[PDB]
RNA sequence: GGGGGCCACUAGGGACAGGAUGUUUUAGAGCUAGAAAUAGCAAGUUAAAAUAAGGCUAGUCCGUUAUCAACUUGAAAAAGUG
DNA sequence: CAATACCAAACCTGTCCCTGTGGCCCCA
DNA sequence: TTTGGTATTG
């Protein structure tokens, strides 16, 4: 008995198929347990497992940090509270008490409801002089007087519960503090670099023009109208642009060659090349131009004048508050005098977005102004307040979702301000005014990590003292060097060859001339004289190195030929192998510490290469600037502090593949020389790393041996590289091929086909407004777009193309893009890529040039820099613009369209390549007589294309609508055509098999499957035998009369296995919404003492697995004990306890007498059958899923098919034919729904409403009857019920709002592929 | 030629350090007429605390990813059963 | 009960590591 | 988005 497996990979299903030598399905008596009559049951071995979908941990990963900062931040407010105690106790002994209880009721609070004074006069005396926190701010940064301490420690904590952000590095307000002396500055340095071209800045009021909340761009304008005679790209418009953040070009404002693109926000090393190239006096300059960027970005923040007060954010704050009550005072004058009836609406309605939502309600900023607009235009005297609202500074609040901006210097130097004001009067705060500026400016380093003590999974750091851990001692404490250390090598990986050695950085001198000499070792070159070309000897190689490679960062092919060949070894012409246009490899850090240090001698010495491989490892392996100072004190006397301070500022990231050892560790034991060495020089043999390693004459290969060196079947697929959701899939996918081993005897299958499934509008607005600023184009400005917009794939293309046909130098129409076109870069008929990397929008196809290749030569003559301007925008990828490009480079040959014809049914992935792998060392365990693995099963690989192309090809259709049936009969499908396709051309193994002339692949590749076929009309026409055999062995693979018969009854088998997998639910608690108090059982308490009748709380909690439970319940005032049988959710929060002690926590449910044995877990999705065949499956603990599936017979899958429009003239012809002649199956079709419906799904007023809708549109179309048909199937779909339409008719779902019946039904319990059952019928219970 | 190093580019994962909102209860004395409903007016911007219940291992740590049909024997971990 | 409609926590900064696809150079 | 919880309405 022999057998083959046919697996079909998807996110959601693993669907699986047994085939017999003729390709047939077997079918088993399988025995049935539990306590129903059934002792056995009759299955097709044929199915599909279906699960929900695999989830990443980045949602754990974001509330497991968030959790983190919250009892950080709760962590520092103790530490101030701390501070503050003994002198609080003194001045009032509850404060912190009530400011802890401030959440209770007055009914629990032990304490004064007034929080701050305990009385209710100070209390309202207090928020009568200081409406918000930001007047008691500016009061104490301000005043002179002794202040309350408690008023102290309110200030103080607002800051440091809320202490701004930390992205500014170093310390704020240095000088500057207005825009004025810094444009002055600028304009001062610019007259000094150009004195014969000065501008005249005289009257020009920089503060409010560069300080106005408007675009960078508008505000660039405004200025440079100011200034007559200068223009905004001109180098004082480049200057102020890039001081307001925009990206100018320097390169026309200098004559210059390189693109000189700047942008605050790589600028360093933008700056430092642009510098190169005009070096004295124009550093300056910049120097004052980004200092005025700081200027205006503080600007943004702070909107008053920085000389009335050391308070300008809490006065800005003041500033808010007082515009909203002259504002709002105004406001309420003008809607009483013109539009009184409105008043009422706009003032006390919470459910309109007026200003009582805005304030009561749940209306936010943007909904108000958008509620209010209208009313104020509607109105006269609101023109300011118009100009307020399109500014977003109308009615403002202080606590908002933009004050993201403020950086945490801002908040230091008030709490600064406040305790040297106060310090003066309380000793404390003299003595522990670091301590607290410390609790508000400490962060944990990112590269420490949580500060665990051996029970955290995710912990790294290393304490130099074994003690509590605070802001003041971390650094004291924690040993900050070995945890940012640790930090990397937990994720950097070993040399494979070399396991224990670690990896070199990336940007290590000797990894980058091991680079450099490794790609020049295998160059070759010709001239005249020379019979043949020959490779570069050791001298020739390091002459290059010494004179191109340290000289230049890039060296081209040009300057090989020309600064070596020509001016050493005196060739007017020579030919160069193995390198094109310039040589990739380079030395890098070589050229940038010849700049920061400027002393070449010192960078050849070898003497030096270990100081220097440390430094650079340093320079990669930290990017704490002051550890990596403290790193290269060891070095401070070798190098000027100039030189020290520009080497600390210069950081490398990035890490090799192979090891110092491995690159100039070990030796050859005869030679004595390592693998740099090698490379250097090896006589006239030149071998490279690869031949090296390989080189049996050589030691290298056997000590990488000798130095080479348990997972489980779970462990080895979660380290694999590929989404969770595939991952999961694959798992399940061993899991069901060891169920159907054991099916057939423990015996292994003959082969296993396997085929795996083809596997954010934010992003597409990032992508867009990144390239249309980059671009300096207008047409964001004239066409403003939202993200939802950019999922149309057209206006998408449109935005990346700046508004232009790609092929044509013209512009482009949103409102025509109807009558645009959508081309494929190379055509879809070679690659079949259907995303934006391969396809483009232009006016019209036909301007691609021929349709048969990639664009025309004329077409990319004319776009070339069109192209490469979007290309620098990052509009378009590197891979599109080669693509579009190629015509140029001899565009698509007749080898690469036979390598697209190949990829289609040639599987490359890697991580298929991997389920092959651990599916092929599963199978296969033993060994032969030469101790080379026995392949007993063969594990095939093939792609979708193929099994579709079958189906379509002879007319085995699929519908993924109709059911779930499909994923089983593509498994069916793929073992066919894969046993198949291997029995026919045993050759192809190699291809298609795990383990170990352009035009006639062409050819071959394309022509593969005709096999099938049994007239081929291939442009002439040819036929082929109606019995198609092997070659060679003369054995029968393919019988087109009988077995094309076979696979039609397969696919038409009613009975199918579709499991759905059972899962425990797991993830969050219950909705995250904290909701208002409410008079009901459904709330869930917040806290263990937080009554959610008093104080709210979540509902909706999630049932992690229902139980059956048998017991009895206290029934009316007497408590009479009453028999029950039902079913009880287990929320997720509850598992933990009722699973400690099931009978503790059901009998404090109310269940008494609990049968415990009779105890049955229900998991999701546990299966039910009832009358008539119906079967449920569990929802919730009070929902259910449909659980039938509806086995639509193959003739009306296929009509469908057809109908729906889901070729040859006479083909198509034929088969609209065969449409119009069986048109009845509509009505068939329906009658069958109909049928299943009343049996199964039971929505007595959905199936009506249904039918009607049918029989209104009888009229219709066929092709658009059949397309709705096909939603019809939502009706009688397996799983939850949802809601569908037909045609403009919309049905919604009929639920199953109850789970009474299933207790006196028959519980299902299914193994993974379904054919091991076990029924409990549950109507014996109780 | 499965594989390996490099260069240019873009998809799929993992971890850590932080920010600004949101929500919730309470505090921010509403007034006047009315028995009451309710009417007329005033006011509104702020703060505290919580932000998965909580856990022990008590760390300025952990608590939503992965994994799970049933049954026998097992404390589990496991194997085994048609 | 049965049916119906409504609801659902979101945004952002920075540091770093990895594998993967895919055009090119060189090899095993 | 999809889909299970919730309060209303009968
Ligand atoms: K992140
Ligand atoms: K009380
Ligand atoms: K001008
Ligand atoms: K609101
Ligand atoms: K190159
Ligand atoms: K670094
Ligand atoms: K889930
Ligand atoms: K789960
Ligand atoms: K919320
Ligand atoms: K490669
Ligand atoms: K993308
Ligand atoms: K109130
Ligand atoms: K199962
Ligand atoms: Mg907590
Ligand atoms: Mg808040």
Not at 270 to 288: P, S, T, V, W
Request: glycine fraction near 4%; hydrophobic fraction near 35%.
């Amino acid at each position: 008995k022999k057998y083959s497996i046919g697996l079909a990979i998807g996110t959601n299903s693993v669907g699986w198929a047994v085939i017999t030598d003729e390709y047939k399905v077997p079918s088993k008596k399988f025995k049935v347990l539990g306590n129903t009559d059934r002792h056995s049951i009759k299955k097709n071995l044929i199915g599909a497992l279906l699960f929900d979908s695999g989830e990443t941990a980045e949602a754990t990963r974001l509330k497991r940090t968030a959790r983190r900062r919250y009892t950080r931040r709760k962590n520092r407010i103790c530490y101030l509270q701390e501070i503050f105690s003994n002198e609080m106790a003194k001045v009032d002994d509850s404060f912190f008490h009530r400011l802890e209880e401030s959440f209770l009721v007055e009914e629990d609070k032990k304490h004064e409801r007034h929080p701050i004074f305990g009385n209710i006069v100070d209390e309202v005396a207090y928020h009568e002089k200081y409406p918000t926190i930001y007047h008691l701010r500016k009061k104490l940064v301000d005043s002179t007087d002794k202040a309350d301490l408690r008023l102290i420690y309110l200030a103080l904590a607002h800051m440091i519960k809320f202490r701004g952000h930390f992205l500014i590095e170093g310390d704020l307000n240095p000088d500057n503090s207005d825009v004025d002396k810094l444009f002055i500055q600028l304009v001062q340095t610019y007259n000094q670099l150009f004195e014969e071209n000065p501008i005249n800045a005289s009257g020009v009021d920089a503060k409010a023009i560069l300080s106005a909340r408007l675009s960078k761009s508008r505000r660039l304008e405004n200025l440079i109208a100011q200034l007559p005679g200068e223009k905004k790209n001109g180098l004082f418009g480049n200057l102020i642009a890039l001081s307001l953040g925009l990206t100018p070009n320097f390169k026309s404002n200098f004559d210059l060659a390189e693109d000189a693109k700047l942008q605050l926000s790589t600028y360093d090393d933008d700056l430092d090349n642009l510098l190169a190239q005009i070096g004295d006096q124009y550093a300056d300059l910049f120097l004052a131009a980004k200092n005025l960027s700081d200027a205006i970005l503080l600007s943004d923040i702070l909107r008053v004048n920085t000389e009335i007060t050391k308070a300008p954010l809490s006065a800005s704050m003041i500033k808010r508050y007082d515009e909203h009550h002259q504002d709002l005072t105004l406001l309420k004058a003008l809607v009483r005098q013109q539009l009184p009836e409105k008043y009422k609406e706009i003032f006390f309605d919470q459910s309109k977005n007026g200003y009582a939502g805005y304030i009561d309600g749940g209306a936010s900023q943007e909904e108000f102004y958008k509620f209010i607009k209208p009313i104020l235009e509607k109105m006269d005297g609101t023109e300011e307040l118009l100009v307020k609202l399109n500014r977003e500074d109308l009615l403002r609040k202080q606590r908002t979702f933009d004050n993201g901006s403020i950086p945490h210097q801002i908040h230091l130097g008030e709490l600064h301000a406040i305790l040297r004001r106060q310090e003066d009067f309380y000793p404390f705060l003299k003595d522990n005014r670091e301590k607290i500026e410390k609790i508000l400016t400490f962060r944990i380093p990112y590269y420490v990590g949580p500060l665990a003590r051996g029970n955290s999974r995710f912990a790294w750091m290393t304490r130099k003292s074994e003690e509590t851990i605070t802001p003041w001692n971390f650094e004291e404490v924690v040993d900050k060097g070995a945890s940012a250390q640790s930090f990397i090598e937990r994720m950097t990986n070993f040399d494979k060859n070399l396991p224990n050695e670690k990896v070199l950085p990336k940007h290590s001198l000797l990894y980058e001339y091991f680079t450099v000499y490794n790609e020049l070792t295998k160059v070759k070159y010709v001239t005249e004289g020379m019979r043949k070309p020959a490779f570069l000897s050791g001298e020739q190689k390091k002459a290059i190195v010494d004179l191109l490679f340290k000289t230049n960062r890039k060296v081209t092919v040009k300057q090989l030929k020309e600064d070596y060949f020509k001016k050493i070894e005196c060739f007017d012409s020579v030919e160069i192998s193995g390198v094109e246009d310039r040589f990739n490899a380079s030395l890098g850090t070589y050229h940038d510490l010849l700049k920061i240090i400027k002393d070449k001698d010192f960078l050849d010495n070898e003497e030096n290469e270990d100081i220097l491989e440390d430094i650079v490892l340093t320079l990669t392996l930290f990017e704490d600037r002051e550890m990596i100072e403290e790193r290269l004190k060891t070095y401070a006397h070798l190098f000027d502090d100039k030189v020290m301070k520009q080497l600390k500022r210069r950081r490398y990231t990035g890490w090799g593949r192979l090891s110092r050892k491995l690159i100039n560790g070990i030796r050859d034991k005869q030679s004595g020389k390592t693998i740099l060495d090698f490379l250097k020089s090896d006589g006239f043999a030149n071998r490279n790393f690869m031949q090296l390693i390989h080189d049996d004459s050589l030691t290298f290969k056997e000590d990488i041996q000798k130095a080479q060196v348990g997972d489980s079947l779970h462990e080895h697929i979660a380290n694999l590289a590929g989404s969770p959701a595939i991952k999961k899939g694959i798992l399940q996918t061993v899991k069901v091929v060891d169920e159907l081993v054991k099916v057939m005897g423990r015996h292994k299958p003959e082969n296993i086909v396997i085929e795996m499934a083809r596997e954010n509008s934010r992003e597409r607005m990032k992508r867009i407004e990144e390239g249309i600023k980059e671009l300096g184009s207008q047409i964001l400005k004239e066409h403003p777009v939202e993200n939802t917009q950019l999922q149309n794939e057209k206006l998408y293309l449109y935005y990346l193309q700046n508004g232009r046909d790609m092929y044509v130098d013209q512009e482009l129409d949103i409102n025509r893009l109807s009558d645009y076109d959508v081309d494929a870069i190379v055509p879809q008929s070679f690659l079949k890529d259907d995303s934006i990397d391969n396809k483009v929008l232009t006016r019209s196809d036909k301007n691609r040039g021929k349709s048969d290749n990639v664009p025309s030569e004329e077409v990319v003559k004319k776009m070339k820099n069109y192209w490469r301007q979007l290309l620098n925008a990052k509009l378009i990828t590197q891979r599109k613009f080669d693509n579009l490009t190629k015509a140029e480079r001899g565009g698509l040959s007749e080898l690469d369209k036979a390598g697209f014809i190949k990829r289609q049914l040639v599987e490359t992935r890697q991580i298929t390549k991997h389920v092959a792998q651990i599916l092929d060392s599963r199978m296969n365990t033993k060994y032969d007589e030469n101790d080379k693995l026995i392949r007993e099963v063969k594990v095939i690989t093939l792609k979708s294309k193929l099994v579709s192309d079958f189906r379509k090809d002879f007319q085995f259709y699929k519908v993924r609508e109709i059911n779930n049936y499909h994923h089983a009969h593509d498994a069916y499908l793929n073992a066919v055509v894969g046993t198949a396709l291997i029995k026919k051309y045993p050759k192809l193994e190699s291809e298609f098999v795990y383990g170990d002339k352009a035009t006639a692949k062409y050819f071959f590749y394309s022509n593969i499957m005709n096999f099938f076929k049994t007239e081929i009309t291939l442009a002439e026409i040819r036929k082929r035998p109606l019995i198609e055999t092997n070659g060679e062995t003369g054995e029968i693979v393919w019988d087109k009369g009988r077995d094309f018969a076979t696979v039609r009854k397969v696919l038409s088998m009613p009975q199918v296995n579709i499991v759905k997998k059972t899962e425990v639910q797991t993830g969050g608690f219950s909705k995250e919404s904290i909701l208002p108090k409410r008079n009901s059982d459904k709330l869930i308490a917040r806290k263990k003492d937080w009554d959610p009748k008093k104080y709210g709380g979540f509902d909706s909690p999630t049932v992690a697995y229902s139980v059956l439970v048998v017991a009895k319940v206290e029934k009316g005032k007497s408590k009479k004990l009453k028999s029950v049988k039902e079913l009880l959710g287990i929320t997720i929060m509850e598992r933990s306890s009722f699973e400690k002690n099931p009978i503790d926590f059901l009998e404090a449910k109310g269940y008494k007498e609990v049968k415990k044995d009779l105890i049955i877990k229900l998991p999701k999705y546990s299966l039910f059958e009832l009358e008539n065949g119906r079967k449920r499956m569990l929802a919730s603990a009070g929902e259910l899923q449909k659980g039938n599936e509806l086995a639509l017979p193959s003739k009306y899958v296929n009509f469908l098919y057809l109908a729906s429009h889901y070729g040859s003239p006479e083909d198509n012809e034929q088969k609209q034919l065969f449409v119009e002649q069986h048109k009845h199956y509509l009505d068939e079709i329906i009658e069958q729904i109909s049928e299943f419906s009343k049996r199964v799904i039971l929505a007595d007023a959905n199936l009506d409403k249904v039918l009607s809708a049918y029989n209104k549109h009888r009229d219709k179309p066929i092709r658009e009857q059949a397309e709705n048909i096909i939603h019809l199937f939502t009706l009688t779909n397996l799983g939850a019920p949802a809601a569908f339409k037909y045609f403009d008719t919309t049905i919604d779902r009929k639920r199953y709002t109850s789970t009474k019946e299933v207790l006196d039904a028959t519980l299902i319990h299914q193994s993974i592929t379904g054919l091991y059952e076990t029924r409990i019928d549950l109507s014996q219970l109780g």
